[PDB]
Design a binder for this molecule. Structure first.
Ligand SMILES: *[C@@H]1O[C@H](CO)[C@@H](O[C@@H]2O[C@H](CO)[C@@H](O)[C@H](O)[C@H]2NC(C)=O)[C@H](O[C@@H]2O[C@@H](C)[C@@H](O)[C@@H](O)[C@@H]2O)[C@H]1NC(C)=O
Ligand SMILES: *[C@@H]1O[C@H](CO)[C@@H](O[C@@H]2O[C@H](CO)[C@@H](O)[C@H](O)[C@H]2NC(C)=O)[C@H](O[C@@H]2O[C@@H](C)[C@@H](O)[C@@H](O)[C@@H]2O)[C@H]1NC(C)=O
Ligand SMILES: *[C@@H]1O[C@H](CO)[C@@H](O[C@@H]2O[C@H](CO)[C@@H](O)[C@H](O)[C@H]2NC(C)=O)[C@H](O[C@@H]2O[C@@H](C)[C@@H](O)[C@@H](O)[C@@H]2O)[C@H]1NC(C)=O
Ligand SMILES: *[C@@H]1O[C@H](CO)[C@@H](O[C@@H]2O[C@H](CO)[C@@H](O)[C@H](O)[C@H]2NC(C)=O)[C@H](O[C@@H]2O[C@@H](C)[C@@H](O)[C@@H](O)[C@@H]2O)[C@H]1NC(C)=O
Ligand SMILES: [Ca+2]
Ligand SMILES: [Ca+2]
Ligand SMILES: [Ca+2]
Ligand SMILES: [Ca+2]
Ligand SMILES: [Mn+2]
Ligand SMILES: [Mn+2]
Ligand SMILES: [Mn+2]
Ligand SMILES: [Mn+2]
Lengths: 233, 233, 233, 233
């Protein structure tokens, strides 16, 4: 048996147990800024990822782990109608490096599906690319930017969101939920996927986010709190 | 700081840490049968309730507690169309006793709202009464059977369901999600409610269920697993 | 599998999830006072016990649960020279009632060993009765006041002490350690005992304590904090 | 607030979440052989270390964290009176590297007390060096191999032992206890140490062990299970 848990109520500028890539960085306020913020306004062409230092044993060939994770984020926008591109929580191999920005969220290099990405991601996509449905949406990505499944949702800017993602091993279900606590709205999605055909035994977990490739088509991507727990029986 | 937590992966006929009211009972297969089962058939006119033996501290007048709970259930039915009445997870005063059966779920005596009930419930409602919407639903009940908010959902008889209910003290958000892992469908609702105004400091928690009042309009109400956690920081 | 856990960093005078017996009572300052305190002084002839409300599943005939519990207490004495009688942590049948005061610590009726007590206790004994070693001591009581095993220790009055008691199921070992963190001294005992032969499947756990029967041979018995976890795999 | 926890009931040869140094390796049976084992006998001159991948946040300059760790080990020896050199659990800067073998257990280079070590350790010492007492002992190393405090203890080769180390912030108490369950003997030690003055904000945790520098003066140093939890309020 094996277990890994961790939780953050706020981050520090010198979070030695977090791996920060590209522009990610932590405020002097304790908030984790995935994408760059200059004046107090989002910048375009930005990419940032944050990973937890230790790999988690997510399966051992014959048995799968269960896991639960909760986080809360905030997106601000100078113009709530021209925004991009989104954030994602993901799982991938321990040696994962940033990919292409803009629409690819730093998780892929192009629009093809490729078994070698070995990446599973849950995305909150705010810019309709050619591979997207024409509305803001949540999507489950198995090895590609073109989701396995998506559902519509309405972003509320300036409002702290609460996310919960769970994977039950006995049914091999991965479920995600999103609630806007003050606005009182919630959205949920579920798919089955056997992690043993997709991932290596050990992965790293974390966040990724990008801003649009043009001026004014832009938004913040802040992580506010984060907790995670796994169990391998 | 105060916390409570418990989990059951299955039950035992002599579960002295549960309080079983009316018909509720535990199987030879270790499954909590809230309502009565004759051969392998649900009997009508049944009422069951099961509570945790320890009262829990859900608020101290000025501060609210956070809590999360997970349970799984199964409803079975000889006839998928003649069904009633549903099951519910609830919070109430420690000395709570069963109320009326049928569409009242063993939680209320009639259909009027009344602050003296001091009860909060998330209901899984399978039969439309005069006070219901005309479709299968999940509702949040605050001191009454007439829900204060509902959303539609479609049952899947014969399939284990996963439910998660979280309460976040800082935003007073009550949120529920329900997933059919095998059929891959999920539903979510959320409301804002200040428990300090509704409940006493200490409550007991658990489930209540009822079968319909007429022969042949009936379903089982089995609880398969359950876990709970509270934090009063 | 079943789990049970709770923690208290401080108490409330109306702690509905504890069972207060005889003299036990909680201060306006949140300190559990097991034996009576008049103006700042402990009273003689005092007896008091406190238990967590929910029974816990400690064995099921074939398998033992493992458990861990931590608590801190303080003893205050007008004269460190004449003190009695001590405090004990114990497991017992859910319906357990207080027995004799004084040297029996509210756990037993007289000095005989009787398998029907179904009581196991770890005691901090501050007065040498005829059935005791001549020195202050920690003791392990199996169905009787006359300890099955003891080690000597010296009480430091006025200092908050830290106690940790663990039972490991696979080796059937019961272990206790005590540390006075500021004075920097520590004590420890262990012994092997199969609970399936002694206790019923379900038990309540808690503390018990008493003062001397003669004016002036007295001390306080204050529980300041408490946490517990059990796991039955 | 931040937390970190993990636990291993057994290990795997490809434990990517552990950092293995020098000779450290994992058996085909799931035991972490800190020091080399050739036929079925220990090897002289061996040095092994193992750390958890993620650094842990032990303080933020003003507030200290609390922590609890539990592990089990087994030492085997061909000849009970020709054994060396012992094993240790420790905290050190994230980029800690192995030091001198033999009686330094791989934590120190010589025998001075240099504050630039930034290392705290609890050793189980099996061979008397010049700086040691003339008996097997548990010692508390703060920035040097010459323990700041020790107590005697009698080893029991072949028997699995249980160690529990707890650090408490409010009192700045470090406390160790060791139990030989089947043999029913236990030992304990405690000391007061402010980790803000010794350790950096983030440290790694783990075990180190060495065999004797001379042919035949040897013993194995195996880790069977390990559990760890921290909280920085
Ligand atoms: C553990 O041992 C107990 C003592 O034998 C069991 O209780 C006994 O169970 C018999 C059923 O096989 C029953 O006819 C006996 O009259 C009963 N005796 C007593 C002292 O209660 C206990 O069995 C469980 O508890 C009882 C009350 C029933 O609900 C049974 O269905 C249970 O098996 C044993 N517990 C377990 C978990 O097996
Ligand atoms: C939260 O509010 C309750 C009602 O406003 C408090 O109970 C009341 O406490 C009064 C003194 O504060 C007491 O004289 C009243 O009789 C009592 N009213 C009721 C409904 O019992 C409660 O105080 C706690 O509980 C009571 C029973 C006392 O034992 C107090 O010592 C307790 O503090 C309030 N709870 C807290 C933690 O403030
Ligand atoms: C999970 O399956 C893996 C691939 O089939 C195992 O790795 C393979 O193990 C072989 C030895 O049995 C070895 O020769 C192969 O080169 C290796 N393949 C790869 C891609 O590394 C893996 O076994 C674990 O990992 C290897 C590296 C060794 O350390 C084994 O001792 C480990 O058990 C399987 N993991 C488990 C938990 O069985
Ligand atoms: C704990 O104390 C450390 C020593 O004073 C702090 O590091 C120092 O912070 C200064 C910022 O006010 C900075 O100029 C110094 O260069 C730095 N010293 C070193 C040795 O790096 C530390 O502050 C954190 O660490 C530095 C790198 C910054 O990133 C700060 O923003 C961090 O807060 C103190 N840690 C905390 C939690 O304050
Ligand atoms: Ca897009
Ligand atoms: Ca209805
Ligand atoms: Ca005595
Ligand atoms: Ca030595
Ligand atoms: Mn998309
Ligand atoms: Mn309804
Ligand atoms: Mn005694
Ligand atoms: Mn030494």
């Amino acid at each position: 048996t094996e277990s890994t848990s961790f939780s953050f109520t706020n981050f520090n500028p010198n979070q030695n147990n977090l791996i920060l890539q590209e522009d990610a960085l932590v405020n002097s306020a304790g908030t984790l800024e995935l994408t760059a913020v200059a004046a107090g306004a989002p910048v375009p062409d930005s990419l940032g990822r944050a990973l937890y230092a230790a790999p988690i044993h997510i399966h051992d060939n014959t048995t799968l782990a269960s896991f639960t994770t909760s986080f809360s984020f905030v997106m601000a926008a100078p113009a709530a109608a021209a925004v991009a591109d989104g954030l994602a929580f993901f799982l991938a191999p321990p040696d994962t490096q940033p990919q292409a920005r803009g629409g690819f969220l730093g998780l892929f290099a192009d629009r093809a599906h490729d078994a070698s990405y070995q990446t599973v991601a849950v995305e909150f996509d705010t810019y309709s690319n050619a591979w997207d449905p024409n509305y803001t949406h949540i999507g489950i990505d198995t090895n590609g930017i073109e989701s396995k499944k998506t559902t519509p949702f309405d972003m509320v800017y300036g409002e702290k969101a609460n996310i919960v993602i769970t994977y039950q091993a006995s049914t091999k279900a991965l479920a995600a939920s999103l609630v806007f606590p003050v606005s009182q709205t919630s959205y949920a999605v579920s798919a089955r996927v056997d992690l043993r055909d997709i991932l290596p035994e050990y992965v790293r977990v974390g966040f990724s986010a990008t801003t649009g490739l043009n001026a004014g088509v832009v938004e913040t991507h802040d992580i506010v709190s984060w907790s995670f727990a796994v169990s391998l029986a």
